Design an enzyme around this catalytic site. Sequence first.
Site, PDB file in Angstrom:
ATOM      1  N   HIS D  15       9.901 -12.056  26.511  1.00 27.36           N
ATOM      2  CA  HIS D  15       9.466 -11.443  25.255  1.00 27.36           C
ATOM      3  C   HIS D  15       8.316 -10.451  25.385  1.00 27.36           C
ATOM      4  O   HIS D  15       8.373  -9.347  24.817  1.00 27.36           O
ATOM      5  CB  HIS D  15       9.139 -12.530  24.221  1.00 27.36           C
ATOM      6  CG  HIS D  15      10.350 -13.275  23.769  1.00 27.36           C
ATOM      7  ND1 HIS D  15      10.787 -14.427  24.385  1.00 27.36           N
ATOM      8  CD2 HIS D  15      11.266 -12.989  22.815  1.00 27.36           C
ATOM      9  CE1 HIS D  15      11.900 -14.836  23.805  1.00 27.36           C
ATOM     10  NE2 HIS D  15      12.213 -13.982  22.851  1.00 27.36           N
ATOM     11  N   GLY D  31      -4.264 -10.252  16.044  1.00 24.18           N
ATOM     12  CA  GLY D  31      -3.230 -10.551  15.062  1.00 24.18           C
ATOM     13  C   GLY D  31      -2.169  -9.500  14.790  1.00 24.18           C
ATOM     14  O   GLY D  31      -1.093  -9.834  14.308  1.00 24.18           O
ATOM     15  N   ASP D  32      -2.454  -8.231  15.059  1.00 27.40           N
ATOM     16  CA  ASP D  32      -1.430  -7.197  14.868  1.00 27.40           C
ATOM     17  C   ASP D  32      -1.657  -5.971  15.746  1.00 27.40           C
ATOM     18  O   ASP D  32      -2.771  -5.762  16.247  1.00 27.40           O
ATOM     19  CB  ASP D  32      -1.305  -6.802  13.389  1.00 27.40           C
ATOM     20  CG  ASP D  32      -2.545  -6.120  12.854  1.00 27.40           C
ATOM     21  OD1 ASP D  32      -3.005  -5.132  13.460  1.00 27.40           O
ATOM     22  OD2 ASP D  32      -3.052  -6.561  11.804  1.00 27.40           O
ATOM     23  N   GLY D  34      -2.065  -2.885  15.140  1.00 24.22           N
ATOM     24  CA  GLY D  34      -3.135  -2.016  14.682  1.00 24.22           C
ATOM     25  C   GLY D  34      -4.479  -2.478  15.205  1.00 24.22           C
ATOM     26  O   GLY D  34      -5.308  -1.665  15.615  1.00 24.22           O
ATOM     27  N   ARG D  35      -4.694  -3.791  15.195  1.00 25.03           N
ATOM     28  CA  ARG D  35      -5.945  -4.359  15.678  1.00 25.03           C
ATOM     29  C   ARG D  35      -6.085  -4.201  17.192  1.00 25.03           C
ATOM     30  O   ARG D  35      -7.191  -4.002  17.693  1.00 25.03           O
ATOM     31  CB  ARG D  35      -6.063  -5.830  15.282  1.00 25.03           C
ATOM     32  CG  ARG D  35      -7.331  -6.505  15.788  1.00 25.03           C
ATOM     33  CD  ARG D  35      -8.608  -5.811  15.294  1.00 25.03           C
ATOM     34  NE  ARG D  35      -8.671  -5.779  13.835  1.00 25.03           N
ATOM     35  CZ  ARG D  35      -8.951  -6.831  13.071  1.00 25.03           C
ATOM     36  NH1 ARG D  35      -9.215  -8.021  13.608  1.00 25.03           N
ATOM     37  NH2 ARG D  35      -8.972  -6.695  11.750  1.00 25.03           N
ATOM     38  N   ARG D  93      -8.260 -16.263  21.102  1.00 28.41           N
ATOM     39  CA  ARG D  93      -7.673 -15.735  19.889  1.00 28.41           C
ATOM     40  C   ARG D  93      -8.798 -15.211  19.001  1.00 28.41           C
ATOM     41  O   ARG D  93      -9.724 -15.949  18.675  1.00 28.41           O
ATOM     42  CB  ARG D  93      -6.879 -16.827  19.156  1.00 28.41           C
ATOM     43  CG  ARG D  93      -6.127 -16.364  17.911  1.00 28.41           C
ATOM     44  CD  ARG D  93      -5.186 -15.227  18.172  1.00 28.41           C
ATOM     45  NE  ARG D  93      -4.212 -15.093  17.089  1.00 28.41           N
ATOM     46  CZ  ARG D  93      -4.384 -14.382  15.977  1.00 28.41           C
ATOM     47  NH1 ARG D  93      -5.513 -13.730  15.738  1.00 28.41           N
ATOM     48  NH2 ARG D  93      -3.414 -14.344  15.074  1.00 28.41           N
ATOM     49  N   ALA D  94      -8.705 -13.940  18.619  1.00 31.17           N
ATOM     50  CA  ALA D  94      -9.669 -13.339  17.698  1.00 31.17           C
ATOM     51  C   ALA D  94      -8.952 -12.811  16.478  1.00 31.17           C
ATOM     52  O   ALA D  94      -7.893 -12.203  16.594  1.00 31.17           O
ATOM     53  CB  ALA D  94     -10.431 -12.227  18.386  1.00 31.17           C
ATOM     54  N   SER D  96      -8.877 -12.868  11.711  1.00 31.63           N
ATOM     55  CA  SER D  96      -9.444 -13.120  10.397  1.00 31.63           C
ATOM     56  C   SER D  96      -9.331 -14.586  10.061  1.00 31.63           C
ATOM     57  O   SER D  96      -8.497 -15.306  10.625  1.00 31.63           O
ATOM     58  CB  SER D  96      -8.711 -12.314   9.322  1.00 31.63           C
ATOM     59  OG  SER D  96      -8.975 -10.937   9.474  1.00 31.63           O
ATOM     60  N   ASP D 211     -12.501 -13.054   5.875  1.00 34.66           N
ATOM     61  CA  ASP D 211     -11.914 -11.974   5.087  1.00 34.66           C
ATOM     62  C   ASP D 211     -11.815 -12.327   3.606  1.00 34.66           C
ATOM     63  O   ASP D 211     -11.419 -11.492   2.792  1.00 34.66           O
ATOM     64  CB  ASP D 211     -10.531 -11.577   5.636  1.00 34.66           C
ATOM     65  CG  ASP D 211      -9.458 -12.668   5.437  1.00 34.66           C
ATOM     66  OD1 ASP D 211      -9.734 -13.696   4.782  1.00 34.66           O
ATOM     67  OD2 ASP D 211      -8.322 -12.491   5.942  1.00 34.66           O
TER      68      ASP D 211
END
Lengths: 242, 242, 242, 242, 242, 242
Positions: D15, D31-32, D34-35, D93-94, D96, D211
């Site tokens: 994957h 998390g995404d 964009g981040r 893991r970083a 929100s 957040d």
Amino acid sequence: NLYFQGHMEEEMQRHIKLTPSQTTPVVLVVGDPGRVDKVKMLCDSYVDLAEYKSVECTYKGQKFLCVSHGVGSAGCAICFEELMNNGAKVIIRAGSCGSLQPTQMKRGDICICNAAVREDRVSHLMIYSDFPAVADFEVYDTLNKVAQELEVPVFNGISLSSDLYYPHKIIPTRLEDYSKANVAVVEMEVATLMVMGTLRKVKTGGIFIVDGCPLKWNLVPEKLENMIKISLETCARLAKKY
Amino acid sequence: NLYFQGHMEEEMQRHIKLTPSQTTPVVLVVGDPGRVDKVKMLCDSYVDLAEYKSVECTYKGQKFLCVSHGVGSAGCAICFEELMNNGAKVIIRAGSCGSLQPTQMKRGDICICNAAVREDRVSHLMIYSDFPAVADFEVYDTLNKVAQELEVPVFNGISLSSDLYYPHKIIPTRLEDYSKANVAVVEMEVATLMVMGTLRKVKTGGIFIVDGCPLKWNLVPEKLENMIKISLETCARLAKKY
Amino acid sequence: NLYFQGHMEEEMQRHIKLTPSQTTPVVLVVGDPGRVDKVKMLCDSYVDLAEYKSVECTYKGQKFLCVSHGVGSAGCAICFEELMNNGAKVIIRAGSCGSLQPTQMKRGDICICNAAVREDRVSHLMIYSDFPAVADFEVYDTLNKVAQELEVPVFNGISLSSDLYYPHKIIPTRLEDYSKANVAVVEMEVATLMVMGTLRKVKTGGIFIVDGCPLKWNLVPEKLENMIKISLETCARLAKKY
Amino acid sequence: NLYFQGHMEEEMQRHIKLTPSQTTPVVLVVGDPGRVDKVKMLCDSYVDLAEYKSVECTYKGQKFLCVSHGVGSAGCAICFEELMNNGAKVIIRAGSCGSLQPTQMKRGDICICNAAVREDRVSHLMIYSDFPAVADFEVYDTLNKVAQELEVPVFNGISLSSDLYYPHKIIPTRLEDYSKANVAVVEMEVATLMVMGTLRKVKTGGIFIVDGCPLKWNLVPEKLENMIKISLETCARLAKKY
Amino acid sequence: NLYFQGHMEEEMQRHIKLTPSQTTPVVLVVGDPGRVDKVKMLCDSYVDLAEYKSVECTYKGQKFLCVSHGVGSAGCAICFEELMNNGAKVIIRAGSCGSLQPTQMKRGDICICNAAVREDRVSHLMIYSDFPAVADFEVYDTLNKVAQELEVPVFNGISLSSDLYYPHKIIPTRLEDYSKANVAVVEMEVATLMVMGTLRKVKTGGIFIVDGCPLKWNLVPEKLENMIKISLETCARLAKKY
Amino acid sequence: NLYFQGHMEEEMQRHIKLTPSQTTPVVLVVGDPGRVDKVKMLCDSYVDLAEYKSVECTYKGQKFLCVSHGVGSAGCAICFEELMNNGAKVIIRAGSCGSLQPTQMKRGDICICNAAVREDRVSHLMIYSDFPAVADFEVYDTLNKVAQELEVPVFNGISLSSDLYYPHKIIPTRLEDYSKANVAVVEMEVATLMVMGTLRKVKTGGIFIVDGCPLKWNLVPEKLENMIKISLETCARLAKKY
């Protein structure tokens, strides 16, 4: 005449440290070493069999053990297992209980129970929850007959065997519900004994003295002595059968 | 789900160092560790179960032990005792014998015995001398039936179990008398096995190959192999019954 | 309970097309698919694992692979690599050889080799020429012990692993020199296996049957069967260790 | 010198599409995609490693990956699995979180968590519910030490890992209960990472920026940058250890 | 979890007294209970499945039944029917035959037949006389291939299945005519099996050893053993397919 | 012409006591023997097939069974099983239900259900709770089409199949919750039928007449007749397909 090396001593059970020859057909289990001392001094004579305390009692001519757990353990499930491994035929648990019926049973009253609610932890490792914790009828009947003969009044009913109340000083959440369901008293491990007994074809029973009324939030010496005398007389009578 | 500490392993027998789970219903006992090796290599497969040598044999789909004594002991009386303690149902002793009937049985011939003269020492510690050392009829019959099917000729008769001949290289004083009394062969401990078997309700038998003629003052490979094959086939057949 | 998509099957090795679960601790490598067929029919049972031929053999209760190269390749160096990738612990090469000692070893004789001359090509890609091609002592010893027990006579010595003799039908220029240097036999790739084994901590050995005497310019069925039986019995014994 | 055909490339994980050589000892998961872009632009330099987004970050001389899930997946459990398959030693893991302690932690505040409530789904497939989701102490300590050095104030506490809140925009029923039980914040999958880490001996930790306050029913740029700087500096420090 | 009363056991077939679970994909049918005994003792192991004799054979790792009729019946037509009812996929009939070609086939020779003359009675109840009694080609081919591999010489030809010769000791009137028509041998019921097989899509074959030459008016042990080995090896090979 | 002894009669199913030849492709199941009588008298003709009541109905030229349980059983799960064993292709359950939507469905109204809540006990023995109890669309559609053609108004919705309401006269605790979740009616075992149908590839459906409104705490003859006519006409139509 045939004695083989390494085959001269019987198998000793790991925790109670007893052999079958040391184990009587009938056994009285009590809650602590101090109570074993109280019981043995009410007997005709006794022999100390030196974690787990064991004494051979002689009462009215009959020999039976009195056993309790010692420092380092929470109950006597292992005792029940090893006693039955050694050929015990009858095991009676005697001790304290809390009354769940304040208007019928007060401090010092004596309850002989025919069955138990299984809130005991250990029984569930042996068999599904739907299986009943129930006393042997002959043991139950004999305890009642002995009390009648001694002119000691008793109550009969179901007990709640709780892994929380005596072991941890915790009030079970269902205690009030069980009171309403006509459960008579709360004690510790009689359900464990009953279930193991049924599974292993060993006769069991229980007798308890009320030490408190938990839902209302030191025993009477004479009343405690009566409960012990019933236990001892019953053990003696059953011992004759073997 | 109920596993108690100190009650997770089975009782191991002191000398053979085996548990009941390791002990098969049928057991073949042979005379030395080398012979166990010979036997196991004639099996379909084997598992070594490491004073006393034990191997689990698989032959024609059936599991049975092959056992012998090791360095430091004179026979397998203790083996018989511990095997029976572990629940063995059939024990067959296979080994060498000396012919007491020179004109009927010569070196390499095979004898399946129905009973034994008790000159073995150990049996007399178990029961009075008048008690017969006798094989189980089914074991005896099965050994004979198997030999017939394998087309291996055999003799049937009484054996002299001697604590002197094989153990000490000593000729028993009564050897000639027993020959005249129609005793077929002399071996070591089959009488011990027979008597213990009867006393403990365990089925026994014996099969022996003639290694010499003691009263006339290295075996044939094929003949020895035949005796072993009879033993293995018989053990397999009996093993199916359990 | 945690199964991820794309992670449900093991990594298959590219050429032998086997996974670690399919790969046994002990592996027998032979020279061609026909010989794999000969070997598997001498086993108790087998399972075909369908360029490279692989079968799981069962012999005396133990599982081990028998592998060879197929059409399109010259040897089994890639097989050795992939078997070791899949966790093989013991690899034994069995096959034919040519005798370099005409007065000591003739057609049908069996050689178990302790080391090899590296005229094999592949080993030199792994390590400098000065490094010895040597068998694992336990494998070598076990092969010899098994032959002794089977009463099969064998020779022990160094083999010449040649990339010319069997692969190309070419007589190496140094063949006579090596004969004079006491090299016993000539075969194909045992040096490749030995070196890779040492480098990868995998135990190796070799056993070969003399098919000819190359310096003098169809095997005996029974003799070939003996060599195969030694291989199978040895593989079974080593397989028990894992 | 020994290169085999079909053995020239490393196994790529299904994957994340990375090989072990591409996988650094330390990995930052965000998390995404964009981040990941935000993070990489705060690094000294980066290399894009083109469903799952992966970049090799260089920060203060050290190389570590920054990874997130892409379109088509709900989290990074599979990422954790494959990163660990490729030999990752530390995964942080970083992201929100939502504050469950309104009077102590408000929007933009940073929480470094030592353990997590397992409401995450995936961890329960790996191990029984009674097993703790707990950070590696060294990772936790390093994150705190780095924040102290950067003079960034942080909070420490337990996180609720929820399969409902971020993934489905659903308020867990037990959210208020957990607030009262002193759970600091709610995030998505740190419990999954922690448990897998413990099971696979991989060091893990988590750092989150508040957040929102979910029980009261766009982040501050500088505050978010601080959280990222702590993450990057921590990853750099740990990377030096390998 | 859904078990209905009266639906816990499989349907047992009336005569052979076997269920589908007891019935293997491949079945060897022989002519009498004694021959079943001969066959089972040549197998690796067997399990007796106790009018009709049935044993589960294990040979070269594969399970298949060996079946015969007992006292009270003339053949195995009912066996064929019930075996096929229970899902048998391959049935091979092995037995004796009489040679109709004295100058080509003598006592002890082995015939593998591809088709049969229908003088068998039972087949005519199933289908018109014009329909051919023919073996399955794969079974026929496999039997021949196995014999070739075992280096056992065989003959191939048509068999006469007679309801008179073996059952009643009667010489069929057309026996000489069929000899002249190149019919190889005479046996009992292979035509019955062939026809039922075709009608029910079950693969069949036959292999027979010459016990006599009927038109010229005790078998060789080794020759009989060879025929049985071909049967067993063939059954094993076919069993692998299922 | 081939008739074997003991193979002349078909297998009879244990409880319904029917063979496949007696079992029609389409079956109507009703709730009691009296209702079977009501149904059969509305048919063109019927044949009694004499614990479980079975009749072969003829209606509009088509044959289908009408079945119910008798004295000694609580429902027809076993009937469903045995009917499907005998090759039934369509099974429709017709009976009474209680309305859970008082303002939409009153006594005498008819509901044709597309799915069911599984509070039925038996279905959970077959498959996990998450699996849907759903009617076959063609059966559901046909029942609706038939009602439309007969100009009988009906309702469509989900049914609650309860092991408590009809069997024990007990109000399920979740009855009000299910009413609020838009469950239309409560009946007994349609969920059992639906699930078994899906698992066994048998087409099912249900049609029920409201006999009461349980949450508000004798049917109309014409309305009941209508429900039965829909059932019979539907069974006839489906029967034509086979």
